[PDB]
Design a protein around this nucleic acid. Structure first.
Lengths: 72, 69
RNA sequence: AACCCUAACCCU
């Protein structure tokens, strides 16, 4: 019954663009406020992977915030 | 309307569908999201959630509970 | 349902 999970989102490169933010200030604020480990596959490859990992709830905040940005 | 794709190991997809797809039928009915699970007995599989923000959230929550189990 | 459990669960 693990309390840490890892979910991988599969994402287009323009989408990843806004998740990171100018100088990476979005995903930085997403790291601080969610408490989830967030990792973004490097290389401006157009089809990229986002790895959220952490306590269920940290996962879920980082996800809310990622959705909240794609709809922004 | 939103589309998120989740990238998932095949042993995880197993519990997401459930015995006879009972569990993923529950999710489709309760979240009101569209859920599609890529085809195959392919070890690395893509789950598409499509729908208004809340459907997405409900499906995602429900998918998170299954991996936690 | 059943002496009916686990492990794998395959839907649209």
């Amino acid at each position: 019954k693990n309390v840490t999970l890892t979910i991988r989102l599969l994402m287009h490169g323009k989408e990843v663009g806004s998740i990171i933010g100018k100088k990476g200030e979005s995903v930085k604020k997403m790291r601080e406020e969610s408490g989830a480990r967030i990792n973004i596959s490097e290389g401006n490859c157009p089809e990229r992977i986002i790895t959220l990992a952490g306590p269920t709830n940290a996962i879920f905040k980082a996800f809310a915030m990622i959705i909240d940005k794609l709809e922004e």
